[PDB]
Amino acid sequence: EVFNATRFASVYAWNRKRISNCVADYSVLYNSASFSTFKCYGVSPTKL
Amino acid sequence: SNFGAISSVLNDILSRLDPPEAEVQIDRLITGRLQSLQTYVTQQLIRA
Incomplete structure (x- = not known):
């Protein structure tokens, strides 16, 4: 629901929704229209 | 101690x-x- 959401809150007040207690879906994040930029500042992105 | 590095756990860098x-x-x-x-x-050598 995060990356596929229709609308996002504007950058002045931005969408905060919790992702919790769950198995990280990054395995499925591979196939998509992908991304303008994909970045991890405090980790190696392969470590997700 | 950080000693200026980002963290003091050697592998959390x-x-x-x-x-x-x-x-x-x-x-x-x-x-x-x-x-x-x-x-x-040193402090040992001196004390010693």
Whole structure:
């Protein structure tokens, strides 16, 4: 629901929704229209 | 102690940073810790 959401809150007040207690879906994040930029500042992105 | 490096757990850099920056950070740990030995080694030599 995060990356596929229709609308996002504007950058002045931005969408905060919790992702919790769950198995990280990054395995499925591979196939998509992908991304303008994909970045991890405090980790190696392969470590997700 | 951080000694100016991002963290004092030697492998919690390595998760965060790609090595070539860690190689810069781990210096400030080594350089920090190393110096911290001599200061301890000396204080033993003097006390001894």
